[PDB]
Amino acid sequence: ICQFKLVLLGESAVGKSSLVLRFVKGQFHEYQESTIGAAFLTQTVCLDDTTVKFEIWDTAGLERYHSLAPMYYRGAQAAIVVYDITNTDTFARAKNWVKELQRQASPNIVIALAGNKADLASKRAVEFQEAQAYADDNSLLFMETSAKTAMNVNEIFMAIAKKL
Amino acid sequence: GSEISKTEAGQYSVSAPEHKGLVLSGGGAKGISYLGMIQALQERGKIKNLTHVSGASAGAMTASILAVGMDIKDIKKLIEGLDITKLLDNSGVGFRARGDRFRNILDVIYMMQMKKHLESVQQPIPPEQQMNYGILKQKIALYEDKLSRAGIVINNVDDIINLTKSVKDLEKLDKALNSIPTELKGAKGEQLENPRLTLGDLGRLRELLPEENKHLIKNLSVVVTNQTKHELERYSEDTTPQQSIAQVVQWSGAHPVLFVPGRNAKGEYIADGGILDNMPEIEGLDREEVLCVKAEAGTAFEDRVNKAKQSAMEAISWFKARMDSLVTSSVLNREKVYYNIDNMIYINTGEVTTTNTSPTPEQRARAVKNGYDQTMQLLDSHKQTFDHPLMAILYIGHDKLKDALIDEKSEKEIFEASAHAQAILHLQEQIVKEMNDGDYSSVQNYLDQIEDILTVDAKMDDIQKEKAFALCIKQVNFLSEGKLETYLNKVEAEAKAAAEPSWATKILNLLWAPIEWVVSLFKGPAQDFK
Ligand SMILES: Nc1nc2c(ncn2[C@@H]2O[C@H](COP(=O)(O)OP(=O)(O)NP(=O)(O)O)[C@@H](O)[C@H]2O)c(=O)[nH]1
Ligand SMILES: [Mg+2]
């Protein structure tokens, strides 16, 4: 039973709160309410023969809650920075979170990068080749997730556990 | 729906509570005992915002001259100079009082003050308001009719007082007003409007008055005893609007020792609403917006105060007992860890007992000052203030506060301290969840994170974070039905049997801290005392 603290960061309306629902309860709501402050869950998965336990903190993405961030990642051993592929600016904001994570968070944190809403390739604005580049340059764990089709949701989380 | 406001000196007061109700207990209290209480509510302005008022026994009378909107100057003259003993009219020697004379002084009091309120109304009178003015005007005529037929003119309060001081004018009064029937009927047996001023006339008067001054008239409700049905009845402005005020007030104060029982509209027997001690409840209101007043006997008063001073001394003793244990469980005693407002006003009758035939003006003004000081002392317990905003959000329920996270104009300091509070609560509810499952593994982990929030994010002082953490520990210990304390007692005992320091040492210390210290503004360590 190795217990770790995880925190989802990113701009609002990217899919942070929905990824958690897909990762835990395996559901999805097209009309989800916005996260006020932060919600707390604990999900237990077992890689190989060893059990790990996540202390998940789904944060609020609005600009106001930015000052409350260090409370959420101070003891985090992992951080998922979620952006939208249908919004270039959300990805541009994710760059600031990572760069802020690198500055202020724990030096041994397993930062992950996620490009969500990947099912909306119709309105895709960010390029997968670009994000994969920026990630590989910044030592991140980049995938393309989709809480609407369960794509890479369980994959990105457990991929962090491998490094844990 | 409370808010938290930063004060001029960097502290955090919470929004003052608003009381819209007032209820007086049915007991062996005299009307003089409620004088200091009203004088206090006036001085602090707790009366103007009252919508409803209730009472039984002598309270039913006191709550009736409040609902009529009598000025606090007249009430002082009325309450101080009105011996009920004067208003006893036995049918003869060896008999109990009729209860007709006490009922008639009430009607005079009401008609004098309900008249001076109609004179303040602005003429003409609106169509849908045309009726209500007529009925009230008709009744006062009836009262002024009979009174003129007896040679008594009442347009002052002092006229009512000296009226009582003369049996001649008193018997004149009884012959006059008793003529007025209690129940008018006629084909087809339908009930006709009661010729006396009723509970509903209080509602009629108020609709007439401008919104500027509609606050002068309160919703009156009294409680009596039904000696036939052997239970309690409640007469209200809303429920029984056709019921005379002077009837139910005399009824509710008709002790079977001094007064003959009354006659219900069915003929059932009716007496004092406080033969046994009873606290009425105002229907349509919450508990936390109603001021409750109870008069206790002298011995009954001191007994309650002493058993409170005692359990507050033990709270400090048990802490020192734990610190002196170093170098018997925390259910001792009555430790309330969430904030609940105290609206209970206790009044010491003292020497004005029900046995005291006649009290000296010495021990009368004593019974007044007690009710004044005690009412003031209680109101001083509604003013919440804290040194740190998180302490307020933790001690007072976040369900009892206006959500600042949703508010876009809420100050950053309160908006941040609220997020700090929901994080701790998240952890608090997890420790409880896991301990009940049987997993006590991350208990220390979660508590370390809680303390970390208090000291890093909240940036509390080293001493005001002790109180904050202790409360967080006490609250979890409460929410887990003691599962935390027991587990904390094992770990520490399993660490002394290994000669090694433990983490459970400081957690148990705070767990045993006096609650009277953690919610205080005491700037010192746990040498709180009293
Ligand atoms: N197509 C698609 N829609 C998604 C995906 N993830 C989330 N959404 C949608 O995006 C909206 C926002 O979801 P939410 O998870 O609340 O975003 P958030 O980042 O948690 N917002 P906040 O942080 O302010 O609570 C919802 O309408 C949800 O259905 C995804 O992978 N694909
Ligand atoms: Mg969210």
XYZ file of C-alpha atoms in Angstrom, chain B residues 255-508:
254
model
C -53.697 30.103 38.154
C -56.225 27.666 39.689
C -54.949 28.640 43.150
C -56.065 32.261 42.804
C -58.473 32.205 39.853
C -61.481 30.073 38.959
C -61.011 28.231 35.647
C -62.239 29.853 32.438
C -64.882 28.787 29.935
C -63.749 27.645 26.488
C -65.943 28.294 23.443
C -67.117 24.731 24.098
C -67.440 25.218 27.848
C -64.210 23.357 28.573
C -62.157 24.386 31.613
C -59.165 26.666 31.009
C -56.401 27.800 33.393
C -52.785 29.038 33.522
C -50.600 27.970 30.604
C -47.724 27.466 33.008
C -49.102 25.359 35.846
C -46.138 23.209 34.911
C -43.087 24.890 33.376
C -43.552 25.137 29.613
C -41.803 26.931 26.757
C -44.127 27.717 23.817
C -42.833 27.584 20.245
C -43.577 30.164 17.556
C -44.820 28.351 14.450
C -43.238 29.411 11.168
C -39.818 30.323 12.554
C -36.492 28.566 13.148
C -34.928 27.973 16.570
C -31.954 30.271 15.961
C -34.078 33.366 15.316
C -36.194 33.142 18.468
C -35.251 34.598 21.855
C -36.425 32.317 24.668
C -36.922 33.627 28.208
C -37.374 31.441 31.296
C -37.796 32.590 34.888
C -36.414 30.089 37.397
C -36.587 29.966 41.192
C -33.637 31.269 43.204
C -32.411 27.802 44.141
C -33.133 26.510 40.639
C -31.150 29.391 39.139
C -27.970 29.066 41.211
C -28.032 25.278 40.824
C -27.856 25.546 37.023
C -25.197 28.269 37.088
C -23.032 26.307 39.532
C -23.233 23.061 37.542
C -22.020 25.120 34.577
C -19.191 26.843 36.446
C -18.244 23.354 37.620
C -18.108 21.608 34.234
C -16.073 24.561 32.949
C -13.505 24.187 35.736
C -13.160 20.455 35.085
C -12.464 21.222 31.425
C -9.275 23.008 32.488
C -8.562 20.439 35.202
C -8.735 17.485 32.810
C -6.244 19.193 30.508
C -3.747 19.822 33.306
C -4.464 16.236 34.348
C -3.222 15.122 30.925
C -0.154 17.365 30.903
C 0.701 16.197 34.423
C 0.076 12.627 33.262
C 3.238 13.092 31.242
C 6.338 13.332 33.484
C -10.477 8.968 31.828
C -11.741 9.356 28.254
C -12.525 12.570 26.364
C -16.294 12.302 26.766
C -16.081 14.420 29.916
C -17.998 16.516 29.441
C -20.645 18.282 27.294
C -18.011 19.445 24.799
C -19.732 21.186 21.889
C -17.351 21.461 18.945
C -19.588 23.202 16.391
C -21.178 26.608 16.987
C -24.825 26.708 18.028
C -26.366 30.026 19.085
C -27.586 30.444 22.667
C -30.939 32.233 22.782
C -31.985 31.110 26.262
C -32.449 33.968 28.743
C -32.699 32.807 32.364
C -34.137 35.195 34.953
C -33.616 34.891 38.713
C -36.885 35.575 40.538
C -34.905 35.572 43.778
C -36.940 37.016 46.637
C -39.963 37.601 44.408
C -40.980 33.960 44.836
C -44.540 32.731 44.317
C -44.585 32.371 48.107
C -43.648 36.012 48.692
C -46.971 37.747 49.368
C -45.568 41.264 49.007
C -41.999 42.177 47.949
C -40.102 45.330 48.934
C -39.140 47.852 46.205
C -35.615 46.884 47.255
C -36.004 43.271 46.114
C -38.220 44.342 43.211
C -35.490 46.420 41.576
C -33.239 43.443 42.319
C -35.381 41.171 40.147
C -35.232 43.809 37.407
C -31.444 44.219 37.382
C -30.982 40.453 37.154
C -33.190 40.294 34.076
C -31.335 43.274 32.634
C -27.819 41.984 33.294
C -28.670 38.428 32.225
C -30.337 39.581 29.005
C -27.287 41.742 28.298
C -24.950 38.873 29.184
C -26.700 36.588 26.692
C -26.715 39.123 23.858
C -22.973 39.511 24.473
C -22.656 35.835 23.518
C -24.014 36.416 20.018
C -21.137 38.684 19.031
C -18.665 36.313 17.387
C -15.120 37.503 16.730
C -11.940 35.640 15.788
C -8.252 36.332 15.149
C -8.154 34.286 11.943
C -10.904 33.825 9.305
C -10.258 30.071 8.995
C -11.080 29.599 12.683
C -14.506 31.072 11.978
C -15.180 28.868 8.933
C -14.105 25.801 10.931
C -15.896 26.517 14.216
C -19.058 27.843 12.581
C -20.470 25.409 10.033
C -19.776 26.224 6.394
C -23.432 25.319 5.940
C -24.192 28.266 8.216
C -22.103 30.694 6.174
C -22.681 32.425 2.841
C -20.529 30.562 0.306
C -17.666 32.935 -0.498
C -16.260 30.724 -3.258
C -19.424 31.310 -5.301
C -19.427 35.040 -4.517
C -17.345 37.008 -7.027
C -17.131 40.077 -4.795
C -16.111 38.259 -1.617
C -12.729 39.417 -0.305
C -9.731 37.323 -1.386
C -8.806 36.698 2.247
C -12.160 35.064 3.009
C -12.355 33.390 -0.408
C -8.938 31.827 0.241
C -9.690 30.877 3.852
C -12.814 29.067 2.652
C -10.823 26.930 0.225
C -8.406 26.199 3.061
C -11.451 25.058 5.033
C -12.928 22.685 2.448
C -9.530 21.042 1.995
C -9.285 20.307 5.717
C -12.890 19.064 5.720
C -12.060 16.744 2.811
C -9.237 15.257 4.877
C -11.355 15.211 8.049
C -14.099 13.194 6.356
C -11.521 10.756 4.975
C -9.941 9.980 8.350
C -13.445 9.168 9.584
C -14.227 7.103 6.478
C -11.023 5.056 6.698
C -11.098 4.516 10.476
C -14.625 3.104 10.237
C -13.388 0.797 7.478
C -10.630 -0.249 9.867
C -7.718 1.474 8.147
C -5.767 3.681 10.554
C -2.695 3.849 8.298
C -2.916 7.348 6.816
C -4.475 8.993 9.881
C -1.178 10.646 10.805
C -0.662 11.464 7.124
C -3.987 13.297 6.776
C -3.514 15.170 10.064
C -0.034 16.298 9.005
C -1.583 17.725 5.835
C -4.269 19.496 7.882
C -1.713 21.150 10.164
C 0.368 21.985 7.091
C -2.557 23.942 5.623
C -3.032 25.875 8.872
C 0.640 26.867 9.096
C 1.636 27.386 5.445
C -1.494 28.485 3.578
C -3.524 30.059 6.382
C -0.290 31.460 7.826
C -1.659 31.357 11.371
C 0.274 32.410 14.456
C 1.977 29.596 16.362
C -0.601 29.948 19.145
C -3.746 30.573 17.079
C -2.906 27.504 14.997
C -2.852 25.358 18.137
C -6.500 26.242 18.763
C -7.302 25.697 15.096
C -5.637 22.278 14.952
C -7.125 21.207 18.291
C -10.605 22.026 16.986
C -9.892 20.029 13.827
C -8.840 17.091 16.008
C -11.804 17.446 18.381
C -14.179 17.587 15.408
C -12.795 14.395 13.843
C -12.914 12.675 17.238
C -16.586 13.676 17.364
C -17.404 12.579 13.809
C -15.876 9.143 14.436
C -17.675 8.467 17.733
C -14.377 8.300 19.624
C -12.488 6.016 17.230
C -9.673 8.566 16.997
C -8.996 8.978 20.726
C -8.852 5.228 21.378
C -6.419 4.697 18.502
C -4.381 7.670 19.722
C -4.245 6.086 23.179
C -2.854 2.796 21.863
C -0.093 4.273 19.684
C 1.163 6.395 22.582
C 0.996 3.460 25.001
C 2.757 1.245 22.456
C 5.484 3.894 22.267
C 6.054 4.205 26.018
C 6.385 0.422 26.179
C 9.273 0.900 23.753
C 10.728 4.024 25.378
C 10.262 6.204 22.291
C 8.559 9.553 21.512
C 5.299 9.402 19.542
C 3.231 11.621 17.245
C 0.098 10.781 19.220
C 1.496 12.844 22.105
C 0.712 16.289 20.667
C -2.506 15.169 18.961
C -3.872 13.907 22.289
